[PDB]
C-alpha cells in the first residue's frame with residue numbers, strides 16, 4: 001500500500017496498551033514503513049490460506065478483542081527488527097532489509113506459530129493450552145530468528161542440525177525478551193501457555209529436564225518423532241547456552257558465566273560465519289569456540305567458559 005505514515009494505538013493480547021506504526025490511505029493499515037522495506041500484518045480470518053488481507057482498520061485505534069493478536073505480532077516484529085539492527089548490525093532477516101510479514105487468526109483453535117519459509121503465521125490457540133501466540137515476545141522472536149537462520153547457516157530441520165536450529169531460535173528469542181525488558185526469564189512461551197496455570201512454560205533453558213527434555217548428551221532422544229526430536233534435544237544446547245551466560249555447576253562441571261551480551265555475540269558469529277546446513281552438535285561446539293577465539297582471544301576466559309559449558313552437557 002502507498003500512503004502516509006502515522007501512529008495508532010491499541011491493546012495487546014495480555015491487555016497492555018502500546019503504539020504501533022500504521023499507514024494511512026482511506027483506511028489505516030498495519031504497515032510500518034519505518035523499518036527496512038516494511039513490516040506488514042495480515043488477517044487470515046480463521047482460514048489456512050495465506051497470507052490473508054493486509055490488516056485495515058477504520059480509525060487507527062485497535063482495542064477490539066479480535067485486534068489483540070495483530071497488534072502484538074506487528075509490534076513485536078518491530079522490536080525484534082530493532083534488536084537485530086541495533087545489536088548485531090543486521091538489516092532484517094536477510095541482511096538487506098526484506099519486508100517482514102505475519103498473519104494472525106490462522107485457522108481455528110490452532111495451538112502453534114511458525115515461519116513458513118516466507119512469512120510468520122500465528123494461531124489463536126484453543127484457549128486452554130494457549131492464548132494467541134503472538135502475545136509472547138519470545139515466541140515472535142523465536143519465529144523471526146528461523147528466517148535469519150534460513151538466510152545464513154541454513155540448518156536442515158531434522159536430527160542434530162534441526163535441534164541446533166531450534167536452540168538458536170530459543171536463545172535469540174530469549175535475548176530479545178531481555179532486550180525489551182519485558183519481565184525476562186530463561187523460559188520459553190510463558191506468557192501465552194496455559195492461561196489456567198501460573199508458573200509453567202513450554203520449555204526451560206535453565207532446566208530443561210523440568211519438562212522432561214534432556215539436559216545432557218547422554219540423554220538425547222534418538223528416535224523419529226518431532227523430526228528426530230528437534231524440539232527435545234534442543235534442550236542440551238539451550239542448557240549449554242544458559243551456562244555460558246549465567247554460569248553454574250552442572251553434572252559436576254563448573255562454568256563461570258560471561259553474560260548475555262557476549263553469549264549473543266558468540267552465537268550470532270557462529271551462526272553467520274561458521275555453521276552450515278548439516279552441522280551437528282559437535283560442530284556447533286567447534287564453531288562456538290572459534291567464534292569466542294575470534295572475538296576475545298584464545299586464552300580468554302570467554303573461550304574457557306564456552307568449553308566448560310559444552311563439556312558440562314556432554315558435547316565433545
Ligand SMILES: [Ca+2]
Pocket residue numbers: 057058059060061062063
Ligand atoms: Ca479500530
Ligand SMILES: [Ca+2]
Pocket residue numbers: 177182183184185190191
Ligand atoms: Ca518472560
Ligand SMILES: [Ca+2]
Pocket residue numbers: 138174177184185186187188189190
Ligand atoms: Ca520467556
Ligand SMILES: [Ca+2]
Pocket residue numbers: 190193194195196197198199200201
Ligand atoms: Ca501457564
Ligand SMILES: [Zn+2]
Pocket residue numbers: 142146166169
Ligand atoms: Zn522453532
